[PDB]
mmCIF file of C-alpha atoms in Angstrom:
data_model
loop_
_atom_site.group_PDB
_atom_site.id
_atom_site.type_symbol
_atom_site.label_atom_id
_atom_site.label_comp_id
_atom_site.label_asym_id
_atom_site.label_seq_id
_atom_site.Cartn_x
_atom_site.Cartn_y
_atom_site.Cartn_z
ATOM 1 C CA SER A 1743 108.183 57.406 100.471
ATOM 2 C CA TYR A 1744 110.379 60.635 101.715
ATOM 3 C CA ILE A 1745 113.328 60.065 98.850
ATOM 4 C CA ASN A 1746 111.825 59.706 95.927
ATOM 5 C CA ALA A 1747 113.537 59.193 92.347
ATOM 6 C CA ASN A 1748 113.984 62.817 91.500
ATOM 7 C CA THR A 1749 115.740 63.659 94.600
ATOM 8 C CA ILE A 1750 118.390 60.516 94.092
ATOM 9 C CA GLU A 1751 119.229 62.189 90.518
ATOM 10 C CA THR A 1752 119.515 65.875 92.013
ATOM 11 C CA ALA A 1753 121.429 64.523 94.908
ATOM 12 C CA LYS A 1754 123.623 62.788 92.331
ATOM 13 C CA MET A 1755 124.266 65.517 89.960
ATOM 14 C CA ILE A 1756 125.557 67.912 92.832
ATOM 15 C CA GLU A 1757 127.491 64.872 94.595
ATOM 16 C CA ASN A 1758 129.533 64.850 90.634
ATOM 17 C CA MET A 1759 130.271 68.579 90.980
ATOM 18 C CA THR A 1760 131.830 68.949 95.002
ATOM 19 C CA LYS A 1761 135.432 69.309 94.106
ATOM 20 C CA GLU A 1762 135.990 65.704 92.313
ATOM 21 C CA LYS A 1763 134.973 66.160 88.622
ATOM 22 C CA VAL A 1764 135.441 70.197 88.875
ATOM 23 C CA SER A 1765 139.425 70.167 89.481
ATOM 24 C CA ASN A 1766 140.136 72.224 86.194
ATOM 25 C CA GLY A 1767 136.729 73.094 84.388
ATOM 26 C CA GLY A 1768 134.032 75.750 83.887
ATOM 27 C CA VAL A 1769 130.793 74.904 85.308
ATOM 28 C CA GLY A 1770 126.824 75.514 84.980
ATOM 29 C CA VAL A 1771 123.919 74.911 87.041
ATOM 30 C CA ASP A 1772 120.243 75.884 85.504
ATOM 31 C CA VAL A 1773 117.052 75.221 87.110
ATOM 32 C CA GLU A 1774 113.732 75.568 85.229
ATOM 33 C CA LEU A 1775 110.227 75.396 86.704
ATOM 34 C CA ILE A 1776 108.296 73.140 83.953
ATOM 35 C CA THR A 1777 105.492 75.829 84.176
ATOM 36 C CA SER A 1778 107.064 78.230 82.290
ATOM 37 C CA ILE A 1779 107.297 76.318 79.245
ATOM 38 C CA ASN A 1780 104.633 76.839 76.749
ATOM 39 C CA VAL A 1781 104.316 73.627 74.383
ATOM 40 C CA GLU A 1782 101.510 74.926 72.228
ATOM 41 C CA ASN A 1783 103.695 78.126 71.406
ATOM 42 C CA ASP A 1784 105.439 77.485 68.564
ATOM 43 C CA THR A 1785 107.539 80.751 68.119
ATOM 44 C CA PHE A 1786 109.470 79.604 71.140
ATOM 45 C CA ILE A 1787 109.807 75.802 70.322
ATOM 46 C CA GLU A 1788 110.707 76.100 66.626
ATOM 47 C CA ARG A 1789 113.657 78.838 67.271
ATOM 48 C CA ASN A 1790 115.126 77.361 70.514
ATOM 49 C CA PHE A 1791 114.895 73.873 69.517
ATOM 50 C CA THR A 1792 116.085 71.397 66.752
ATOM 51 C CA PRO A 1793 113.827 68.725 64.935
ATOM 52 C CA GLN A 1794 115.709 66.009 66.866
ATOM 53 C CA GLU A 1795 114.525 67.564 70.684
ATOM 54 C CA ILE A 1796 110.872 67.895 69.120
ATOM 55 C CA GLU A 1797 110.677 64.233 67.748
ATOM 56 C CA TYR A 1798 112.197 63.156 71.073
ATOM 57 C CA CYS A 1799 110.673 65.506 74.078
ATOM 58 C CA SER A 1800 106.903 65.163 72.091
ATOM 59 C CA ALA A 1801 106.729 61.440 71.828
ATOM 60 C CA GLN A 1802 107.644 61.306 76.017
ATOM 61 C CA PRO A 1803 105.137 60.708 78.725
ATOM 62 C CA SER A 1804 105.238 64.393 79.947
ATOM 63 C CA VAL A 1805 106.291 66.246 77.474
ATOM 64 C CA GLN A 1806 106.483 69.590 78.968
ATOM 65 C CA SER A 1807 108.704 68.143 81.908
ATOM 66 C CA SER A 1808 110.783 66.976 78.857
ATOM 67 C CA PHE A 1809 111.540 70.086 77.105
ATOM 68 C CA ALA A 1810 112.162 71.808 80.803
ATOM 69 C CA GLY A 1811 114.643 69.272 80.923
ATOM 70 C CA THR A 1812 116.468 69.908 77.486
ATOM 71 C CA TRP A 1813 115.909 73.857 78.107
ATOM 72 C CA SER A 1814 117.724 73.833 81.656
ATOM 73 C CA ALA A 1815 120.596 71.690 79.407
ATOM 74 C CA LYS A 1816 120.893 74.296 76.973
ATOM 75 C CA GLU A 1817 121.036 76.906 79.981
ATOM 76 C CA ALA A 1818 123.835 75.080 81.466
ATOM 77 C CA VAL A 1819 126.163 74.452 78.692
ATOM 78 C CA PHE A 1820 125.651 77.917 77.571
ATOM 79 C CA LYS A 1821 127.020 78.831 81.268
ATOM 80 C CA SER A 1822 129.305 75.978 81.489
ATOM 81 C CA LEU A 1823 131.602 77.276 78.556
ATOM 82 C CA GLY A 1824 131.996 80.805 80.153
ATOM 83 C CA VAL A 1825 130.701 82.903 77.422
ATOM 84 C CA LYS A 1826 128.471 86.046 77.961
ATOM 85 C CA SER A 1827 126.584 86.157 74.594
ATOM 86 C CA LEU A 1828 126.292 84.158 71.226
ATOM 87 C CA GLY A 1829 125.298 87.415 68.994
ATOM 88 C CA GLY A 1830 122.093 89.632 69.821
ATOM 89 C CA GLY A 1831 119.403 87.415 71.395
ATOM 90 C CA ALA A 1832 119.531 83.795 72.878
ATOM 91 C CA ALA A 1833 119.004 81.224 69.794
ATOM 92 C CA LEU A 1834 119.816 78.174 71.740
ATOM 93 C CA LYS A 1835 118.918 75.737 68.822
ATOM 94 C CA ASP A 1836 122.954 75.639 67.921
ATOM 95 C CA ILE A 1837 123.744 73.759 71.429
ATOM 96 C CA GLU A 1838 122.034 70.492 70.730
ATOM 97 C CA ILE A 1839 121.174 67.490 73.389
ATOM 98 C CA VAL A 1840 120.696 64.232 71.734
ATOM 99 C CA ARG A 1841 118.860 62.418 74.626
ATOM 100 C CA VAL A 1842 119.158 58.562 73.457
ATOM 101 C CA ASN A 1843 116.302 56.433 75.254
ATOM 102 C CA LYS A 1844 117.768 54.677 78.177
ATOM 103 C CA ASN A 1845 121.126 56.211 77.810
ATOM 104 C CA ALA A 1846 123.403 59.228 79.111
ATOM 105 C CA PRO A 1847 122.423 62.295 77.235
ATOM 106 C CA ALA A 1848 125.291 63.690 74.997
ATOM 107 C CA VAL A 1849 125.900 67.427 73.714
ATOM 108 C CA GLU A 1850 126.815 68.253 69.923
ATOM 109 C CA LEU A 1851 127.148 72.101 69.329
ATOM 110 C CA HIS A 1852 126.884 73.549 65.711
ATOM 111 C CA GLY A 1853 127.192 77.272 64.290
ATOM 112 C CA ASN A 1854 128.287 80.138 66.126
ATOM 113 C CA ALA A 1855 128.445 78.438 69.593
ATOM 114 C CA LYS A 1856 130.830 75.536 68.555
ATOM 115 C CA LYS A 1857 133.692 78.395 67.338
ATOM 116 C CA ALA A 1858 133.543 80.401 70.586
ATOM 117 C CA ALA A 1859 133.856 76.987 72.588
ATOM 118 C CA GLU A 1860 136.640 75.747 70.634
ATOM 119 C CA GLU A 1861 138.451 79.317 71.120
ATOM 120 C CA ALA A 1862 137.787 79.340 74.623
ATOM 121 C CA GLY A 1863 139.730 75.660 74.988
ATOM 122 C CA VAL A 1864 136.829 72.929 74.953
ATOM 123 C CA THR A 1865 137.348 69.412 73.822
ATOM 124 C CA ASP A 1866 134.466 67.715 75.547
ATOM 125 C CA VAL A 1867 130.927 68.853 77.364
ATOM 126 C CA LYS A 1868 129.307 66.281 79.661
ATOM 127 C CA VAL A 1869 125.548 67.689 80.986
ATOM 128 C CA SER A 1870 123.410 65.575 83.380
ATOM 129 C CA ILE A 1871 119.623 66.301 83.308
ATOM 130 C CA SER A 1872 116.493 65.409 86.206
ATOM 131 C CA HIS A 1873 112.920 66.220 85.388
ATOM 132 C CA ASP A 1874 109.742 66.056 87.381
ATOM 133 C CA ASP A 1875 106.395 67.689 87.826
ATOM 134 C CA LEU A 1876 108.048 71.064 89.363
ATOM 135 C CA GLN A 1877 111.839 71.571 88.615
ATOM 136 C CA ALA A 1878 114.072 70.309 85.467
ATOM 137 C CA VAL A 1879 118.283 70.662 87.226
ATOM 138 C CA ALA A 1880 120.580 70.769 84.429
ATOM 139 C CA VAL A 1881 124.262 70.608 85.867
ATOM 140 C CA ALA A 1882 127.139 70.901 83.051
ATOM 141 C CA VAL A 1883 131.003 70.532 82.810
ATOM 142 C CA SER A 1884 133.315 71.897 80.007
ATOM 143 C CA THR A 1885 136.877 70.571 80.271
ATOM 144 C CA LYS A 1886 140.062 71.442 77.431
ATOM 145 C CA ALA B 1405 84.058 78.609 93.658
ATOM 146 C CA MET B 1406 82.430 80.259 96.791
ATOM 147 C CA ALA B 1407 80.549 78.899 99.639
ATOM 148 C CA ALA B 1408 79.597 81.674 102.864
ATOM 149 C CA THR B 1409 77.349 82.054 105.852
ATOM 150 C CA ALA B 1410 75.785 85.091 107.460
ATOM 151 C CA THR B 1411 73.415 85.816 110.091
ATOM 152 C CA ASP B 1412 71.127 89.039 110.096
ATOM 153 C CA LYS B 1413 70.388 92.052 112.310
ATOM 154 C CA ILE B 1414 69.066 92.599 115.908
ATOM 155 C CA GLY B 1415 65.570 90.878 116.121
ATOM 156 C CA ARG B 1416 63.055 89.107 118.479
ATOM 157 C CA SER B 1417 62.090 86.329 115.683
ATOM 158 C CA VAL B 1418 64.115 83.036 115.309
ATOM 159 C CA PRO B 1419 62.358 81.883 112.092
ATOM 160 C CA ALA B 1420 62.522 85.391 110.333
ATOM 161 C CA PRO B 1421 64.766 85.163 107.361
ATOM 162 C CA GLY B 1422 67.203 88.353 106.702
ATOM 163 C CA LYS B 1423 69.533 89.850 104.139
ATOM 164 C CA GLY B 1424 72.846 88.906 105.905
ATOM 165 C CA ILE B 1425 73.935 87.173 103.166
ATOM 166 C CA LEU B 1426 73.887 90.436 100.836
ATOM 167 C CA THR B 1427 77.390 90.694 102.271
ATOM 168 C CA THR B 1428 78.614 88.348 99.611
ATOM 169 C CA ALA B 1429 78.087 90.939 96.855
ATOM 170 C CA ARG B 1430 79.740 93.799 99.360
ATOM 171 C CA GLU B 1431 82.410 95.794 97.520
ATOM 172 C CA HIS B 1432 83.166 99.892 97.240
ATOM 173 C CA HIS B 1433 82.245 102.064 94.562
ATOM 174 C CA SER B 1434 83.430 105.061 95.718
ATOM 175 C CA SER B 1435 86.343 105.121 93.433
ATOM 176 C CA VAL B 1436 84.950 103.313 89.898
ATOM 177 C CA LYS B 1437 86.092 105.597 87.143
ATOM 178 C CA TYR B 1438 88.832 103.373 85.568
ATOM 179 C CA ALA B 1439 89.178 99.388 85.508
ATOM 180 C CA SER B 1440 91.419 97.663 88.408
ATOM 181 C CA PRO B 1441 93.957 95.799 86.434
ATOM 182 C CA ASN B 1442 93.725 92.978 89.039
ATOM 183 C CA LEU B 1443 90.428 91.510 87.496
ATOM 184 C CA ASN B 1444 92.595 91.377 84.253
ATOM 185 C CA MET B 1445 93.885 87.929 84.309
ATOM 186 C CA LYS B 1446 96.893 89.078 81.519
ATOM 187 C CA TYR B 1447 98.120 91.615 84.136
ATOM 188 C CA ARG B 1448 97.732 88.552 86.785
ATOM 189 C CA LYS B 1449 99.561 86.137 84.805
ATOM 190 C CA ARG B 1450 102.641 88.576 83.747
ATOM 191 C CA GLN B 1451 103.106 88.756 87.559
ATOM 192 C CA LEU B 1452 103.175 85.406 88.070
ATOM 193 C CA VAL B 1453 105.589 85.010 85.197
ATOM 194 C CA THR B 1454 108.081 87.497 86.846
ATOM 195 C CA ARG B 1455 107.676 85.642 90.038
ATOM 196 C CA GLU B 1456 108.566 82.030 88.881
ATOM 197 C CA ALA B 1457 111.840 83.545 87.331
ATOM 198 C CA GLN B 1458 112.626 84.995 90.432
ATOM 199 C CA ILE B 1459 111.941 81.269 92.464
ATOM 200 C CA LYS B 1460 114.208 79.560 89.072
ATOM 201 C CA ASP B 1461 116.929 82.186 90.526
ATOM 202 C CA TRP B 1462 116.311 81.296 94.177
ATOM 203 C CA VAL B 1463 116.791 77.653 93.540
ATOM 204 C CA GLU B 1464 119.890 77.820 91.760
ATOM 205 C CA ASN B 1465 121.522 80.003 94.639
ATOM 206 C CA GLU B 1466 120.430 77.157 97.422
ATOM 207 C CA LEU B 1467 122.014 74.559 94.823
ATOM 208 C CA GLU B 1468 125.354 76.685 95.002
ATOM 209 C CA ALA B 1469 125.232 77.425 98.860
ATOM 210 C CA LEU B 1470 124.148 73.509 99.043
ATOM 211 C CA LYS B 1471 127.518 72.265 97.151
ATOM 212 C CA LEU B 1472 129.575 75.166 99.430
ATOM 213 C CA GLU B 1473 128.064 72.898 102.909
ATOM 214 C CA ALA B 1474 128.730 69.295 101.253
ATOM 215 C CA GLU B 1475 132.503 69.751 101.353
ATOM 216 C CA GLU B 1476 133.086 70.359 104.401
ATOM 217 C CA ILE B 1477 131.027 66.799 104.950
ATOM 218 C CA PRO B 1478 133.540 63.904 105.177
ATOM 219 C CA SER B 1479 132.475 62.293 101.414
ATOM 220 C CA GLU B 1480 131.891 58.777 102.986
ATOM 221 C CA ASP B 1481 128.431 60.095 104.356
ATOM 222 C CA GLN B 1482 127.727 63.066 101.961
ATOM 223 C CA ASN B 1483 125.145 61.429 99.946
ATOM 224 C CA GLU B 1484 122.892 61.364 102.715
ATOM 225 C CA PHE B 1485 123.238 65.158 103.693
ATOM 226 C CA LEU B 1486 122.306 65.624 99.598
ATOM 227 C CA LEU B 1487 119.478 63.325 99.489
ATOM 228 C CA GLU B 1488 117.858 65.091 102.781
ATOM 229 C CA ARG B 1489 118.767 68.589 101.644
ATOM 230 C CA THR B 1490 117.861 68.607 97.909
ATOM 231 C CA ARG B 1491 114.417 67.136 99.343
ATOM 232 C CA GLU B 1492 114.049 70.354 101.401
ATOM 233 C CA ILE B 1493 114.585 72.525 98.524
ATOM 234 C CA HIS B 1494 112.459 70.719 95.925
ATOM 235 C CA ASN B 1495 109.704 71.699 99.121
ATOM 236 C CA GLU B 1496 110.628 75.087 99.075
ATOM 237 C CA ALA B 1497 110.423 75.502 95.522
ATOM 238 C CA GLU B 1498 107.210 73.979 95.570
ATOM 239 C CA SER B 1499 105.808 76.228 98.273
ATOM 240 C CA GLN B 1500 106.723 79.370 96.687
ATOM 241 C CA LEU B 1501 105.484 78.739 93.012
ATOM 242 C CA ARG B 1502 101.941 77.532 94.796
ATOM 243 C CA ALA B 1503 101.721 80.688 97.419
ATOM 244 C CA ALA B 1504 102.651 82.543 93.914
ATOM 245 C CA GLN B 1505 99.926 81.134 92.231
ATOM 246 C CA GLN B 1506 97.420 81.476 95.256
ATOM 247 C CA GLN B 1507 98.170 85.122 95.088
ATOM 248 C CA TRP B 1508 97.642 85.772 91.457
ATOM 249 C CA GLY B 1509 95.401 83.071 90.467
ATOM 250 C CA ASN B 1510 93.112 82.141 93.504
ATOM 251 C CA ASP B 1511 93.231 84.783 96.351
ATOM 252 C CA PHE B 1512 93.901 88.088 94.341
ATOM 253 C CA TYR B 1513 90.744 89.345 95.455
ATOM 254 C CA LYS B 1514 90.788 88.663 99.392
ATOM 255 C CA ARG B 1515 92.644 92.126 100.243
ATOM 256 C CA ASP B 1516 90.672 94.308 97.357
ATOM 257 C CA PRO B 1517 87.758 96.209 98.735
ATOM 258 C CA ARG B 1518 86.610 97.044 95.086
ATOM 259 C CA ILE B 1519 85.873 93.339 94.559
ATOM 260 C CA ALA B 1520 83.167 90.974 95.936
ATOM 261 C CA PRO B 1521 83.633 87.729 97.094
ATOM 262 C CA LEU B 1522 80.970 86.944 94.489
ATOM 263 C CA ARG B 1523 82.677 88.240 91.786
ATOM 264 C CA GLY B 1524 86.222 87.390 92.581
ATOM 265 C CA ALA B 1525 84.981 83.566 92.729
ATOM 266 C CA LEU B 1526 83.608 83.700 88.863
ATOM 267 C CA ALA B 1527 86.649 86.149 87.920
ATOM 268 C CA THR B 1528 89.224 83.256 88.963
ATOM 269 C CA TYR B 1529 88.166 81.646 85.609
ATOM 270 C CA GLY B 1530 87.473 84.429 83.026
ATOM 271 C CA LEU B 1531 83.768 84.170 84.166
ATOM 272 C CA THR B 1532 81.843 87.554 84.397
ATOM 273 C CA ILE B 1533 78.866 88.089 87.357
ATOM 274 C CA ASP B 1534 76.572 87.712 83.345
ATOM 275 C CA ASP B 1535 77.471 84.035 83.562
ATOM 276 C CA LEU B 1536 75.834 82.828 86.921
ATOM 277 C CA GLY B 1537 73.340 81.307 84.973
ATOM 278 C CA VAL B 1538 70.229 79.837 87.089
ATOM 279 C CA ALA B 1539 69.780 80.594 90.892
ATOM 280 C CA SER B 1540 68.940 77.734 93.191
ATOM 281 C CA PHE B 1541 66.465 79.346 95.562
ATOM 282 C CA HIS B 1542 65.779 77.748 99.073
ATOM 283 C CA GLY B 1543 62.028 78.828 97.789
ATOM 284 C CA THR B 1544 59.845 76.926 100.777
ATOM 285 C CA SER B 1545 56.484 77.934 99.733
ATOM 286 C CA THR B 1546 56.556 80.599 102.521
ATOM 287 C CA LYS B 1547 55.503 84.010 102.713
ATOM 288 C CA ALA B 1548 58.327 85.799 103.900
ATOM 289 C CA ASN B 1549 61.121 83.566 102.658
ATOM 290 C CA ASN C 1695 72.197 94.569 137.777
ATOM 291 C CA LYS C 1696 72.614 95.678 134.328
ATOM 292 C CA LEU C 1697 76.469 93.776 133.122
ATOM 293 C CA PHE C 1698 73.755 92.664 130.214
ATOM 294 C CA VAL C 1699 71.721 95.431 128.492
ATOM 295 C CA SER C 1700 69.814 94.083 125.200
ATOM 296 C CA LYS C 1701 70.424 96.164 121.981
ATOM 297 C CA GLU C 1702 66.746 97.263 120.903
ATOM 298 C CA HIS C 1703 67.970 98.371 117.581
ATOM 299 C CA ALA C 1704 70.760 97.425 114.998
ATOM 300 C CA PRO C 1705 73.728 99.964 114.542
ATOM 301 C CA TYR C 1706 72.253 100.828 111.071
ATOM 302 C CA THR C 1707 68.299 101.903 110.306
ATOM 303 C CA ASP C 1708 66.587 99.531 107.932
ATOM 304 C CA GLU C 1709 66.911 102.232 105.011
ATOM 305 C CA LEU C 1710 70.992 101.845 105.112
ATOM 306 C CA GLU C 1711 70.564 97.706 106.091
ATOM 307 C CA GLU C 1712 71.835 96.625 102.776
ATOM 308 C CA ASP C 1713 73.690 99.668 101.835
ATOM 309 C CA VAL C 1714 75.907 98.626 104.924
ATOM 310 C CA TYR C 1715 75.954 94.957 104.012
ATOM 311 C CA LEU C 1716 77.450 96.057 100.618
ATOM 312 C CA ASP C 1717 79.938 98.389 101.384
ATOM 313 C CA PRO C 1718 83.442 96.437 103.254
ATOM 314 C CA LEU C 1719 84.758 99.698 104.292
ATOM 315 C CA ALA C 1720 81.423 101.542 105.976
ATOM 316 C CA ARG C 1721 82.217 101.609 109.899
ATOM 317 C CA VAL C 1722 80.359 102.974 112.671
ATOM 318 C CA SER C 1723 81.015 106.685 114.484
ATOM 319 C CA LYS C 1724 79.447 107.867 117.783
ATOM 320 C CA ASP C 1725 75.968 109.830 117.193
ATOM 321 C CA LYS C 1726 76.394 113.256 118.291
ATOM 322 C CA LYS C 1727 72.863 113.814 119.547
ATOM 323 C CA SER C 1728 71.964 109.585 120.599
ATOM 324 C CA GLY C 1729 75.578 108.915 121.952
ATOM 325 C CA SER C 1730 75.627 105.695 120.882
ATOM 326 C CA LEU C 1731 77.557 103.872 117.859
ATOM 327 C CA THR C 1732 75.533 103.741 114.497
ATOM 328 C CA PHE C 1733 76.035 103.734 110.575
ATOM 329 C CA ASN C 1734 76.037 107.507 109.325
ATOM 330 C CA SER C 1735 75.015 107.517 105.324
ATOM 331 C CA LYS C 1736 78.078 109.754 104.823
ATOM 332 C CA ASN C 1737 80.557 106.966 105.730
ATOM 333 C CA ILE C 1738 78.789 104.266 103.691
ATOM 334 C CA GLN C 1739 80.177 104.508 99.941
ATOM 335 C CA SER C 1740 82.554 107.116 100.849
ATOM 336 C CA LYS C 1741 85.588 108.369 99.038
ATOM 337 C CA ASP C 1742 87.879 108.713 102.309
ATOM 338 C CA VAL D 1453 114.619 89.647 104.221
ATOM 339 C CA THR D 1454 115.630 88.421 100.704
ATOM 340 C CA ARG D 1455 112.219 88.364 99.656
ATOM 341 C CA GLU D 1456 111.475 92.080 101.216
ATOM 342 C CA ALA D 1457 114.292 93.782 99.032
ATOM 343 C CA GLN D 1458 112.507 91.906 96.016
ATOM 344 C CA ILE D 1459 109.016 93.138 96.692
ATOM 345 C CA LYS D 1460 110.393 96.766 97.024
ATOM 346 C CA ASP D 1461 112.199 96.188 93.739
ATOM 347 C CA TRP D 1462 108.707 95.012 92.538
ATOM 348 C CA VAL D 1463 107.183 98.586 93.807
ATOM 349 C CA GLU D 1464 109.642 100.673 92.141
ATOM 350 C CA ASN D 1465 109.107 99.146 88.492
ATOM 351 C CA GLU D 1466 105.249 99.495 88.934
ATOM 352 C CA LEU D 1467 105.814 103.175 90.121
ATOM 353 C CA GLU D 1468 107.897 103.472 87.116
ATOM 354 C CA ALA D 1469 105.161 101.424 84.696
ATOM 355 C CA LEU D 1470 102.067 103.840 86.260
ATOM 356 C CA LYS D 1471 104.112 106.984 85.313
ATOM 357 C CA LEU D 1472 104.300 105.832 82.112
ATOM 358 C CA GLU D 1473 100.381 105.136 81.943
ATOM 359 C CA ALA D 1474 99.394 108.463 83.470
ATOM 360 C CA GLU D 1475 100.904 110.654 80.662
ATOM 361 C CA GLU D 1476 98.344 109.058 77.987
ATOM 362 C CA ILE D 1477 95.646 110.399 80.505
ATOM 363 C CA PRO D 1478 94.563 113.800 79.992
ATOM 364 C CA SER D 1479 96.337 115.972 82.878
ATOM 365 C CA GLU D 1480 92.760 117.152 83.793
ATOM 366 C CA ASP D 1481 91.693 113.813 85.097
ATOM 367 C CA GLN D 1482 94.842 111.771 85.531
ATOM 368 C CA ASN D 1483 94.834 112.605 89.638
ATOM 369 C CA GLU D 1484 91.949 110.175 90.172
ATOM 370 C CA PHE D 1485 93.814 107.560 87.682
ATOM 371 C CA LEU D 1486 97.138 107.690 90.082
ATOM 372 C CA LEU D 1487 94.659 107.800 93.624
ATOM 373 C CA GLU D 1488 92.723 104.651 92.402
ATOM 374 C CA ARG D 1489 96.249 103.044 90.945
ATOM 375 C CA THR D 1490 98.711 103.818 93.790
ATOM 376 C CA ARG D 1491 96.003 102.274 96.342
ATOM 377 C CA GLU D 1492 96.158 99.193 93.836
ATOM 378 C CA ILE D 1493 99.885 98.856 94.401
ATOM 379 C CA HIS D 1494 99.705 99.331 98.129
ATOM 380 C CA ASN D 1495 97.468 96.089 98.454
ATOM 381 C CA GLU D 1496 99.463 94.458 96.169
ATOM 382 C CA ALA D 1497 102.806 95.433 97.829
ATOM 383 C CA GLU D 1498 101.180 94.638 100.985
ATOM 384 C CA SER D 1499 99.594 91.286 99.977
ATOM 385 C CA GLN D 1500 103.122 90.429 98.916
#
């Protein structure tokens, strides 16, 4: 009753960064509230999402909770790298989250975000996402 | 939208109806030159989007601080600390988003004497006083009523 | 034998009845003459 | 104490923005704009 599915995932994602996995790696916690995602708005969704993440999130039961889950992973990766800016504004289309159905989510990063990552000393970038009706939390680690 | 009750004035007639429900339309008009921005829904929504960013920030800083309290706990029984205490930060994040919605969405007019209870009730859905279509009169077939 | 004292009149006249109901900021003031708390028409829909 | 700091900040930014809306008003009748609209920011600061 009290400890629902969302509290198991959020408790497990900040039990994987309590000084065990985070030995030699820059970490990135980002939450985004579901309400602040506007799905009908096509300026925000085209410029900050790939055609692979729009095809996935649109087909889910909770389309607004799934866009807020992905959007949190892109702001968790972007902090975990250490880098402050990727030239002008925030175009986080470049940082792609390939979420396979019943499978741990993968980060494959292209464009100017790939360059400043391999320059900083970053081989692999993990990420975890829990999303529900309110909050969408995202933890990322970036090791050499 | 609204549901009120009023008495009337000093009398000596218990069946005599009065005007006391007029108070659902009580508002101040001394200072009615420029439109109050509390009635504009765009404004009200801008203030909520701002306050939602602040709550997003607030949740990060309590998950940073919950990581720095989980370390001192022996790692055998820190699972049950995190389950208990992420659920507590879920709640406090929900309360604050509701309280902000209550302030800009639902109760924007409760402490503004330039907005009548009747007008505010209808303004919470972008309706004007000019949309109250039909009035269902008590209409008892008495002279006084 | 006066703890209880029925009011004979409201704090407003039947002329101000509606103007008072409609102003949320209308308050009552000692009336110089009668010495009793009434609504004065100056304090109804008043800038101050 | 945290949330009171945020409201303090919030009032500054609505008094900056009320200065940048008072300029476009002719300076003859911008007194009655400021009286109306600082009172509205007093309320919204109190509510919060």
